[PDB]
Amino acid sequence: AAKNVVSQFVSSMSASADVLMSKIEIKLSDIPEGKNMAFKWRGKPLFVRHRTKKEIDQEAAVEVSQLRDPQHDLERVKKPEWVILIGVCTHLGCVPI
Amino acid sequence: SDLELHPPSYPWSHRGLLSSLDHTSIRRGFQVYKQVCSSCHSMDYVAYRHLVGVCYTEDEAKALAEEVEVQDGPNEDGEMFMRPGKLSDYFPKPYPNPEAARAANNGALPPDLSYIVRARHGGEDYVFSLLTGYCEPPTGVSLREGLYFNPYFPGQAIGMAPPIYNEVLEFDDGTPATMSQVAKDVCTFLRWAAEPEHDHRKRMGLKMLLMMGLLLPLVYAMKRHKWSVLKSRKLAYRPPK
Amino acid sequence: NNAFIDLPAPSNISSWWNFGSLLGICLILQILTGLFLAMHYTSDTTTAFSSVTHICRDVNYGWIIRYMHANGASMFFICLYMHVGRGLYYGSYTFLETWNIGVILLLTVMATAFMGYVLPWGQMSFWGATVITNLLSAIPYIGTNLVEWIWGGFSVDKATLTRFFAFHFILPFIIMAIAMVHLLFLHETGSNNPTGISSDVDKIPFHPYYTIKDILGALLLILALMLLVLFAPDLLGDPDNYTPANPLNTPPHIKPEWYFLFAYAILRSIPNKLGGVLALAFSILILALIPLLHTSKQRSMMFRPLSQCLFWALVADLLTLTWIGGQPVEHPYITIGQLASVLYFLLILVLMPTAGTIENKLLKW
Amino acid sequence: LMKIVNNAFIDLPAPSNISSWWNFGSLLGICLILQILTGLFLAMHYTSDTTTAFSSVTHICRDVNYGWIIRYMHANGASMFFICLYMHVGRGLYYGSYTFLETWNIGVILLLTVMATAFMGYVLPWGQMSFWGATVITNLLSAIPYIGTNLVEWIWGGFSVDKATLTRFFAFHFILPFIIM
Amino acid sequence: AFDQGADAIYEHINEGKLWKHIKHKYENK
Amino acid sequence: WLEGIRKWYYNAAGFNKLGLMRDDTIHENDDVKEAIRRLPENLYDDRVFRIKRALDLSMRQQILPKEQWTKYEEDKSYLEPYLKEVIRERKEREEWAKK
Amino acid sequence: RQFGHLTRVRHVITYSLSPFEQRAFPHYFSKGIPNVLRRTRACILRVAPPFVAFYLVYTWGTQEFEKSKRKNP
Amino acid sequence: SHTDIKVPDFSDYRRPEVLDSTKSSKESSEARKGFSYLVTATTTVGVAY
Amino acid sequence: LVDPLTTVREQCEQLEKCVKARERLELCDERVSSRSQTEEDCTEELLDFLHARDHCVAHKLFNSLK
Numbered sequence A: 001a002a003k004n005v006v007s008q009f010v011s012s013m014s015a016s017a018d019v020l021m022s023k024i025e026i027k028l029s030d031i032p033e034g035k036n037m038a039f040k041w042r043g044k045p046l047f048v049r050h051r052t053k054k055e056i057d058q059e060a061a062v063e064v065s066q067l068r069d070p071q072h073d074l075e076r077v078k079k080p081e082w083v084i085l086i087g088v089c090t091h092l093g094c095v096p097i
Numbered sequence B: 001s002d003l004e005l006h007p008p009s010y011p012w013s014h015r016g017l018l019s020s021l022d023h024t025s026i027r028r029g030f031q032v033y034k035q036v037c038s039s040c041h042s043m044d045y046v047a048y049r050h051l052v053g054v055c056y057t058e059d060e061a062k063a064l065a066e067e068v069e070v071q072d073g074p075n076e077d078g079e080m081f082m083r084p085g086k087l088s089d090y091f092p093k094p095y096p097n098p099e100a101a102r103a104a105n106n107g108a109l110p111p112d113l114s115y116i117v118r119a120r121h122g123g124e125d126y127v128f129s130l131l132t133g134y135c136e137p138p139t140g141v142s143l144r145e146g147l148y149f150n151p152y153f154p155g156q157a158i159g160m161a162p163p164i165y166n167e168v169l170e171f172d173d174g175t176p177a178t179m180s181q182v183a184k185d186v187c188t189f190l191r192w193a194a195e196p197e198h199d200h201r202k203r204m205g206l207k208m209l210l211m212m213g214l215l216l217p218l219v220y221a222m223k224r225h226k227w228s229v230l231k232s233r234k235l236a237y238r239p240p241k
Numbered sequence C: 001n002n003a004f005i006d007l008p009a010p011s012n013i014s015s016w017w018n019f020g021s022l023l024g025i026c027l028i029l030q031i032l033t034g035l036f037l038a039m040h041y042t043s044d045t046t047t048a049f050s051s052v053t054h055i056c057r058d059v060n061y062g063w064i065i066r067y068m069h070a071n072g073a074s075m076f077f078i079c080l081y082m083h084v085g086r087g088l089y090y091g092s093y094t095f096l097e098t099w100n101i102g103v104i105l106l107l108t109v110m111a112t113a114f115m116g117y118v119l120p121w122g123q124m125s126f127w128g129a130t131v132i133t134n135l136l137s138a139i140p141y142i143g144t145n146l147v148e149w150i151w152g153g154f155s156v157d158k159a160t161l162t163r164f165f166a167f168h169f170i171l172p173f174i175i176m177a178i179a180m181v182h183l184l185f186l187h188e189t190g191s192n193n194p195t196g197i198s199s200d201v202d203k204i205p206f207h208p209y210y211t212i213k214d215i216l217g218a219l220l221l222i223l224a225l226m227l228l229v230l231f232a233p234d235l236l237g238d239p240d241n242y243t244p245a246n247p248l249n250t251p252p253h254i255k256p257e258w259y260f261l262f263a264y265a266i267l268r269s270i271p272n273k274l275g276g277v278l279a280l281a282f283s284i285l286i287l288a289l290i291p292l293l294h295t296s297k298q299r300s301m302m303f304r305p306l307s308q309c310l311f312w313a314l315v316a317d318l319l320t321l322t323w324i325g326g327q328p329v330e331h332p333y334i335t336i337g338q339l340a341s342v343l344y345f346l347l348i349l350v351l352m353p354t355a356g357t358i359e360n361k362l363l364k365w
Numbered sequence D: 001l002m003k004i005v006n007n008a009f010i011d012l013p014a015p016s017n018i019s020s021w022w023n024f025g026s027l028l029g030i031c032l033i034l035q036i037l038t039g040l041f042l043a044m045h046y047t048s049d050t051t052t053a054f055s056s057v058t059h060i061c062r063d064v065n066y067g068w069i070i071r072y073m074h075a076n077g078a079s080m081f082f083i084c085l086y087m088h089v090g091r092g093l094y095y096g097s098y099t100f101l102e103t104w105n106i107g108v109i110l111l112l113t114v115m116a117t118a119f120m121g122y123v124l125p126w127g128q129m130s131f132w133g134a135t136v137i138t139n140l141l142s143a144i145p146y147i148g149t150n151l152v153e154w155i156w157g158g159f160s161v162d163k164a165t166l167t168r169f170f171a172f173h174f175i176l177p178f179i180i181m
Numbered sequence E: 001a002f003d004q005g006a007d008a009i010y011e012h013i014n015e016g017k018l019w020k021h022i023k024h025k026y027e028n029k
Numbered sequence F: 001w002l003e004g005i006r007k008w009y010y011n012a013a014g015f016n017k018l019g020l021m022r023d024d025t026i027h028e029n030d031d032v033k034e035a036i037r038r039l040p041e042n043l044y045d046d047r048v049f050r051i052k053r054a055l056d057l058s059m060r061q062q063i064l065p066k067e068q069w070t071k072y073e074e075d076k077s078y079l080e081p082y083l084k085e086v087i088r089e090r091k092e093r094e095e096w097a098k099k
Numbered sequence G: 001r002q003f004g005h006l007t008r009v010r011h012v013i014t015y016s017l018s019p020f021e022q023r024a025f026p027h028y029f030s031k032g033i034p035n036v037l038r039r040t041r042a043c044i045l046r047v048a049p050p051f052v053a054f055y056l057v058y059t060w061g062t063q064e065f066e067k068s069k070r071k072n073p
Numbered sequence H: 001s002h003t004d005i006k007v008p009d010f011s012d013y014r015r016p017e018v019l020d021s022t023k024s025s026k027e028s029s030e031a032r033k034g035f036s037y038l039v040t041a042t043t044t045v046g047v048a049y
Numbered sequence I: 001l002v003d004p005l006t007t008v009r010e011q012c013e014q015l016e017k018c019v020k021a022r023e024r025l026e027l028c029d030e031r032v033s034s035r036s037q038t039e040e041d042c043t044e045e046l047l048d049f050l051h052a053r054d055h056c057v058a059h060k061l062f063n064s065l066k
């Protein structure tokens, strides 16, 4: 009995039914080269950024083995001129600028 | 750029500890907001009734409210309708939502000004310097279309074109509407808008100081009185030899 | 009587012993002003910020109650840090139970003030709520689950604000009960005093001596508080919280409330997530270790010059951390902050205990 | 932690013959703790704005996990509280327990305080009974000569039960149970 | 006496700036 | 000269300015409380008076005339023999407890 | 802890005057200032050095930060 | 002998009106108390305000 | 209509600090404009100048405003 009651109360603090994941469609034409566009999606910033060739090149030149979370730029994008990211700092959740 | 230019300190007549706001200045500042700033900036937390007894009489504020039309209703048919504004109405918003605001301002969002003075380091010194501080970009600086160089704005590129200039409006009291005069009055008004309790808190401050000026020495005298018994006590040790 | 009036008190406790009653007064003032604010505040994210402005603009004297509550929180912390400092310098922490309950009081007041700060739902409120609750994400395996559970979702939102109002409302009362136990434990031994030597041979009644000193102290607290409320209500606050919360944008110069800056400087000094959260937690919990690191044969620092120097180095170091926390993460602040953070733990964990031992040898015991 | 936890409970001397009517005191304590716990969990989702109060309660019952059980436990808990209260008082009257004057008079204050607390809690959902209950009961003060009307409007925070009333009733309902404890 | 005296000081320090001081210019009932 | 620095430290510590002896300043743990209880009456009554006098000076934020400050060369441990024995007795009991 | 059961004290005599028989500020300034000066001197070597160090790091650091943001430091 | 016990001189602490040991201090007790009582009454009114 | 701000700014720009700042600015303009490719701009020099000038303006301007 105790286990059920306690978990029901603990459960009441978890996300309620109304809070629980619609996809989102974004128009790439409205985002000029060099611009980082932010949208609210699933309750967080969604960044859709149109990169320049220079930005793409700089990211290509990164010595991947020296990164704390090693990934090549091309493992993170489908089309290099577009980088799409969840705009939430992995440290403590602020929005990177 | 990352460089910062901090506003100097202006000698506002309400700068001193016991210095109230200049209410004629607030009155003109409101005119500036009404004729100039209001077309792009909302002031969501200020209503016409708030002006009564501060810079306009009740009748004058009623006439000001009536100059605009606000949506009301539903009526008996379930329809929204337009009516002249009244004292209880808040200042009309230039835009239905921040998206419209951005769309009408090349992507930039004119913030609400109810608290601008308290929401910016520098307060009115900052707003005044910003308003009277536009100038041509320094050599080597090129701003994207829609942006203006203002050395006091963070990054120096602001999306608000200079909103005031000589004769941008005519004041109800004949006061020469030079750009700096207009900036000074709107800043005074913005201070009041962000802190309507400004004059009252300083008057209470005066009374508080006077009361503490009395009560502190009195309580301290009581403390010294009671403690004197211990402060002058003398001890002697007399063990049997 | 024998609970207050005839309570035996050391005849020589100084002004540093006034902070306990000042904390009690701070607590009561926070509770009273807080209750009056709660009478007009609504915790819906669509009306939270507006309800606060309504209190300040249309509720009779709402502005004075609101700014007293805000500056009261600052006065509370000033008194807290003085109170803890007194305890460290005079060796009061040897009253183990009283001291440990004190440590719990500190953490609870910090949690309480944090949550209250979220209520207006300004930019600092939102990001403060985001960052601080996220400290729990550093916990292996369950961290993220704990955060989302606290939030009542996948991000700080409506559910978060509503429960923070309820927590903020009840915690002060829990703090009051815990403070009463803090006192019960203290009455078993009575107060320590500046010399750190037993004062059983020279006790005086609490009343009238300290009742009158307490009233005087209270008057000066009210003076400090009202000077802020009536002449500089925003001095200790952040202009950024006058801007409604925007979940898509974190202000570029965002910084914590002044009383949290030192801990923030410490966490920010470590380029590792778990490392920073552990050091932040330890910067406070190290308080519970102080009693175990006491090596001196004497209780108070009054008679220990070397310890005093280190004590003041520690205070100056907390001032350095407080200053660094208010600066951008850029050179040379990054290095000063890391050095200051190292010095903090060095002073407490090594230098002070060592000084204790060296003084013992100099006195031949 | 020994004493007062202990000589205060375990070795507390109790009459060997107290019947079931003496169980209501501990049951009232349990009702109080149940109300406080369920109430706190409800407070975590309730909003006191007249535009969202009723809706926040339906959200608790419909979308908050186990919100319906916590909500109905709080509601029926109040009824159980009163059943126990009346049994408790009845026991005191029949057995002459009221001769313990201080205990009995504090008991009378408890009764009035629980009634005031339940009344205010009932206003929170902001349904029809909530609104009219708030109107009628606060208006009892209007029977006070010359100032009654002033008192009522002061309590309401206006000329009628409105937003100001609901918000302060949530704060009073929140704190009173702890005072009762 | 305290309130009146204090207010007088305040109003004097702020002579001509308060609403009560410029009010006549807009009234006339 | 370690002793040079010792006399300097003794005066910097400053309990001698309150007329106290080093042992008057020891933190009283249970070993110390028992050692004090074992003190002969005169030593006990003397300790009590030096502490009362020191607490009284502290209260007034005053110190004694320099001629009355405890002197480094004259401060001797009146508590040591009693405290050492109390500590040896307790150590003995602990050994037996460990068995 | 109550008076009557605190501790054992023997052969100590205490003399006191009613507060109504004495000044509350005896030699407030003539002896007060000197004592405040003694107490200040007695601690400054222990209290001041760390804050002067802070003051030094602060001015150095602030200035070092400003110099690093311009073209020709 | 306990008769060797003499109260120390307090002349340095005494209010001027009780410095003469050959004069009764009752002649000034009303004034001395009135002063202190003025301080208390005024503190009370200030605090009530 | 003449804004006193214009007047006050001219008088303030006469001060040595401002003339010196103005000279470093004109130097920068020359240096920067003479290039086709440069990441340099004269914001720093302008801010230094405005800081010196506006500090002076702030001390006088309100004497001309109602």
Ligand SMILES: CCCCCCCC/C=C/CCCCCCCC(=O)OC[C@H](COP(=O)(O)OCCN)OC(=O)CCCCCCC/C=C/CCCCCCCC
Residues within 6 Å of the ligand: A001, A002, A004, A005, A006, D030, D033, D034
């Ligand atoms: C202050 C202490 C807080 C600790 C928690 C208090 C719990 C008290 C212990 C309960 C003893 C009473 C027995 C009740 C039997 C209820 C039967 C039960 O648990 O059924 C399970 C059922 C869920 O079933 P499903 O959703 O279909 O699926 C389950 C698989 N996941 O849950 C329930 O029915 C909920 C029962 C609510 C119990 C009422 C709460 C009582 C709390 C009182 C706190 C105070 C102390 C009183 C002293 C205890 C004396 C026994």
Ligand code: HEC
Residues within 6 Å of the ligand: B032, B033, B036, B037, B038, B039, B040, B041, B105, B108, B109, B110, B111, B116, B120, B127, B153, B157, B158, B159, B160, B161, B163, B164, B186
């Ligand atoms: C539309 C044509 C505008 C008028 C008329 C005024 N302002 Fe404005 N303002 C506008 C925009 C689009 C912006 C955003 C600028 C950006 O790039 O972010 C602003 C901004 C301000 C600010 C805030 C600056 C800041 O530090 O964030 C202030 C204080 C401000 N505006 C003041 C202001 C006043 C008082 C006006 C009338 C005299 C005024 N503005 C008019 C657009 C427009």
Ligand code: HEM
Residues within 6 Å of the ligand: C016, C017, C018, C019, C020, C021, C023, C024, C027, C080, C083, C084, C087, C090, C092, C093, C095, C098, C099, C101, C102, C103, C105, C106, C109, C175, C179, C182, C183, C186, C190, C191, C192, C193, C287
């Ligand atoms: C809500 C906060 C707190 C309250 C209301 C409170 C209150 C008090 C009071 C009234 C006293 C006696 C008066 C005094 O000596 O100042 C006291 C003593 C004490 N408190 Fe606290 N306290 C609080 C927090 C703390 C903290 C955070 C610590 C330390 C981590 C602490 C440690 C002590 C100690 C050790 C004593 C005895 C000090 C001595 O006798 O020298 N207190 N406190």
Ligand code: HEM
Residues within 6 Å of the ligand: C027, C030, C031, C032, C033, C034, C035, C037, C038, C041, C052, C066, C069, C070, C073, C076, C109, C112, C113, C114, C115, C116, C117, C118, C119, C120, C168, C169, C172, C173, C175, C237
């Ligand atoms: C230990 C005592 C308390 C502390 C330290 C404290 C501190 C704070 C702080 C820092 C804020 C933010 C103020 C601002 O900047 O706007 C706040 C807000 C608030 N607090 Fe408290 N608080 C305390 C007790 C209470 C209590 C008991 C209540 C209610 C019963 C309460 C109700 C409120 C409300 C409604 C707000 C939101 C309005 C506002 O922002 O002023 N607080 N509190």
Ligand code: HEM
Residues within 6 Å of the ligand: D032, D035, D036, D037, D038, D039, D040, D042, D043, D046, D057, D071, D074, D075, D078, D081, D114, D117, D118, D119, D120, D121, D122, D123, D124, D125, D173, D174, D177, D178, D180
């Ligand atoms: C003696 C204690 C208490 C009594 C008798 C009591 C009684 C009530 C009553 C009669 C209602 C109306 C329930 C309904 O029909 O919907 C209510 C609602 C409510 N109470 Fe309490 N309550 C108690 C304690 C508390 C406490 C401690 C809190 C908060 C910390 C709380 C929070 C609420 C909330 C938020 C509601 C609105 C949601 C709802 O209507 O269920 N209550 N309470």
Ligand SMILES: C/C=C(C)/C=C/C=C/[C@H](OC)[C@@H](C)[C@@H](OC)[C@@H](C)CCc1oc2c(O)c(OC)cc(OC)c2c(=O)c1C
Residues within 6 Å of the ligand: C107, C108, C110, C111, C114, C124, C125, C127, C128, C129, C131, C132, C133, C150, C167, C254, C255, C256, C257, C260, C263, C264, C267, C280, C281, C284
């Ligand atoms: C449901 C209740 C919960 C989850 C409560 C948990 C409370 C935890 C701790 O209290 C015990 C915590 C308040 C205490 O940590 C010891 C503080 C010193 C933490 C200080 C702190 O503040 C920040 C802050 O205020 C901000 O505002 C704008 C922003 C911040 O960075 C961007 C921070 C930050 O980086 C830190 C370390």
Ligand SMILES: C/C=C(C)/C=C/C=C/[C@H](OC)[C@@H](C)[C@@H](OC)[C@@H](C)CCc1oc2c(O)c(OC)cc(OC)c2c(=O)c1C
Residues within 6 Å of the ligand: D112, D113, D115, D116, D119, D120, D129, D130, D132, D133, D134, D136, D137, D138, D155, D172
């Ligand atoms: C700010 C707090 C305030 C003002 C609290 C005051 C509380 C007063 C008392 O508690 C001490 C009160 C609850 C208690 O009187 C002894 C009850 C027995 C009153 C009973 C009561 O209920 C009604 C009710 O509930 C209704 O709902 C739909 C409607 C009602 O008529 C239409 C009544 C009614 O005609 C009466 C007499």
Ligand SMILES: CCCCCCO[C@@H]1O[C@H](CO)[C@@H](O)[C@H](O)[C@H]1O
Residues within 6 Å of the ligand: B121, C235, C236, C237, C238, C239, C257, C258
């Ligand atoms: C009592 C000492 C107060 C020190 C004056 C500066 O105080 C600081 O002002 C900043 C903005 O001006 C605030 O963001 C900051 O929180 C505050 O501590």
Ligand SMILES: CCCCCCO[C@@H]1O[C@H](CO)[C@@H](O)[C@H](O)[C@H]1O
Residues within 6 Å of the ligand: F004, F005, F008
């Ligand atoms: C914190 C610096 C500690 C230095 C050790 C002190 O050393 C002492 O200094 C006295 C005054 O200068 C000398 O009279 C004395 O002989 C010497 O041993």
Ligand SMILES: CCCCCCO[C@@H]1O[C@H](CO)[C@@H](O)[C@H](O)[C@H]1O
Residues within 6 Å of the ligand: F030, F031, F033, F034, F089, F090, F092, F093
């Ligand atoms: C507060 C702690 C009190 C300690 C009392 C110690 O008491 C001592 O214990 C010895 C055992 O080794 C006995 O031989 C000795 O006679 C006795 O006085």
Ligand code: FES
Residues within 6 Å of the ligand: A089, A090, A091, A092, A093, A094, C131
């Ligand atoms: S660096 Fe900490 S939240 Fe991003």
